[PDB]
Structure 1
């Protein structure tokens, strides 16, 4: 009967390049959304995104080695070290075999995909870099990190669009509990603010277009939302078995108590008005954690700020809490952070964790006027202290109707 605890964090976000700086900015209702400079956004309908500011990996990645990896991989490795360091774990020949990784990404190396295709179109297969495949494939963060640290235990990479982070974190926990691993670095990495990332989700009409105020673009549940905002970043947490952590007196941020998955079985890029999918996922985590919706102090919504998106998640909240629907805090970090896709669920697992450490729940900024019949506490504009909140739940939903929820318990 093994328990999984969190003994390390690390992250890179549009509002900070450390876990602490990122948390501080989120609690301080800071936006990270900005105008895109790295490419001509003239032809683009959306000209902004939550970018990672002044990213530097020189200390961690040999620029000779950087040539072999998309930014998403770069982002992920940097956030992985952060967490490896913050864990204090020392991998030993006796260890390696029982320390693994579960780290994916929604879209992968778009950047380098684009470079290599441009290259091919211009000068043929000759120009296609020898590093094309290993520099853009989704499981590369797992591979670089496992190597860098001599990790030899289980290594997997779940690519479930926006649900990725939650899935990897959840499946890492499962791996540990099952007995396959003792420690697992898990999370996601994404850097889809590229012509194909921006143009592509804009072609789907899924992006915000509020270019006169990029800062106000992300407004989950607000009556004025017009689609999500793109965000780059990486979120990683070190998960480990209770006794293995204790026996080494690791700093322990929390306990991963429940994990729930569901499927919408409705539409490829959209949820039932019903919110049936999200409920089942929340529903299953609760049954996994073995607690009740009443005990959930804060819900880090999937809330991407898309019209149908936000409404459906709300439906699921009511449905799941019913009574305590109005008494529960629910917010979207996406109001400041943007949508980190493959990394969203990872960075939000961290927020959901830090909210328990600090007994503070970050705001859903930009929430001027809510949707009508909403009875919920969307924790609008300004952060909000909480008292005896012992469990926080994290939601992440993805294209394909693949949903997932994680439950974190204090201590």
Structure 2
């Protein structure tokens, strides 16, 4: 009598749209949300562009008084979390409140208000630090505010595993529901790292693309001309619900979450990933957790950060898991349009994987003009691909030098 976990609510902010549907429609059109940064001076920065949330307006959800106590990434998470709750139509009562929690994380956190508070410190001493510094920056405050404004008393965790946070938070929200500690969980991630310390940080590690002259073509996964990943802001939120609890209250049902896999690479990051044995181990554990064969997977929302080493390692992991049906399964990196949302990347890409089950369509990998000579795989390049019979999707968040996570979704 092991309980099944199902998805009943969606919410999202992304560089190509401020709702789930506008974002999804923008991706199917191959539209890029990457643009030049203008909220700080990028003169001395090697990367001057990122995937920004445009025309963000949370004034009707978060008052200006509370916005000052929130870093941008928390504001993104609350708005996306409110959208998911409103979409689920869930009615929180005094009786079911202790059965509803959250699992929302971030890879970086409140980098913008950390910079501001430390600037206040270096100029005026500790008396200039805001009393809201800590609650406005730590990664668990998205779950914090959401459990408060909806009256959630259930289990709430916050997984910060860098760019695996989104997949890890959703996967363990499902584990918490399967274990019986909760019937409903709001799970996802949120990121706003397009700051001087964020762009400078990854730029210091030489991991960022430098194609300032053409920001929309900089993110080119599996293309011979890639030169690093592109930062992206946003948030993704899902309302995860037990299957009987959902059908009983008459709930909208997007797809069933049937598999969750985890693994560690056990090499640093500068070491050559080569075979992607960690990535393949994560996908393998998720297939066994669901009890299906890799040949039943129709679409794979890849990690695909447009990194020279990372993309080649993920391609070898896909070849290892799929093998014979590798050249037939559809793989795609939505980061070609949105950029890398880091701790939220797994969250937004889980929704893309669910929507591919609903609309029977696959978003493309734009800017893939000429792939590696080492690959045959169908990366669904340039334009989206209509599909039929698609029943299982696979969402991957990899580290190529760290933690790995994989989620499998099933239709109906």
Query: Which TM-score tier does this pair reach, normalised by the shorter chain?
Result: over 0.9
What aligned pairs does 1:240-389 form with structure 2 within 5 A after superposition?
Answer: 240-268=241-269, 272-389=273-390
Equivalent-residue separation in structure 1 for 2:24 and 2:202 (angstroms): 28
Give the Cα–Cα distance (whole angstroms) in 2 for the partners of residues 268 and 175 of structure 1: 31
1:349-373 CA-to-partner distances (Å, cap 9, x unmatched) read: 0000000000000000000000112
Please give the per-residue CA displacement for 1:356-391, whole angstroms capped at 9, x wherever unaligned: 000000000000000112010101000001110100
Counterpart Cα distance in 1 of 2:333 and 2:25: 15
Partner SS state of residue 260, structure 1: strand
Q: Is the 8 A contact 1:160 1:398 kept in 2?
A: no
CA shift, 1:304, in A, is 0.4
* Superposed displacement of residue 268, structure 1: 3.6
How far residue 398 of structure 1 moved from its aligned partner, in angstroms, is 3.1
**SS of equivalent residue, structure 1 residue 240:** strand
Q: TM-score, normalised by structure 1?
A: 0.99
Q: Give 1:274 shift.
A: 1.1
Matches of 2:271 and 2:87, distance apart in 1: 38
Report the equivalent of 1:114: 115
Residue by residue over 1:41-93, the C-alpha shift from the partner in whole angstroms, topping out at 9 and shown as x without a partner, is 00000000000001011000011011111000000000000000000001000
Distance 1:265 1:64 in 2: 45
Q: Is the 8 A contact 1:271 1:401 kept in 2?
A: no
What is the root-mean-square deviation in Å for CA atoms of aligned residues?
0.8
Question: Is 262-271 or 307-316 further displaced after alignment?
Answer: 262-271
CA deviations 1:104-153 (Å, max 9, x no partner) are 00000000000001110111111110011000000000000000000010
Shift of 1:239: 0.3
Q: CA–CA distance in 2 between the matches of 1:199 and 1:74? A: 23
Task: Note if contact 2:273-2:400 (Cα within 8 Å) is conserved in structure 1.
Answer: no
Corresponding pairs, count: 411
Query: 1:257-295 CA distances to partner (integer Å, 9 max, x unpaired)?
Result: 000000000114666111101000000000001001100
| 1:284-326, Cα deviation, whole Å (9 max, x unpaired) | 0000010011000000001100110100000000000000000
> How far apart, CA to CA, are the structure 2 residues paired with 1:259 and 1:374?
27
Q: Give the aligned partner of residue 181 of structure 2.
A: 180
* Separation of aligned partners in 1, 2:197 and 2:398: 21
Q: Are the structure 2 counterparts of residues 306 and 131 from structure 1 closer, same or farther at C-alpha, using a change threshold of 3 Å?
A: same
What TM-score, normalized to structure 2? 0.99
Q: 1:14 to 1:37 in 2, by over 3 A?
A: same
Deviation at 1:397, TM superposition (A): 1.5
Deviates more, 1:399-408 or 1:168-177: 399-408
- Relative to 1, partners in 2 of residues 1:177 and 1:271: Cα closer, same or farther, differing over 3 Å? farther
More divergent stretch after superposition (262-271 vs 4-13): 262-271
What runs of 5+ residues in structure 2 fail to find an aligned partner? Answer: none
Structure 1 segments (4+ residues) deviating >4 Å: none
- Residues 109 and 137 in structure 2, CA contact (< 8 A), matched pair in contact too: yes
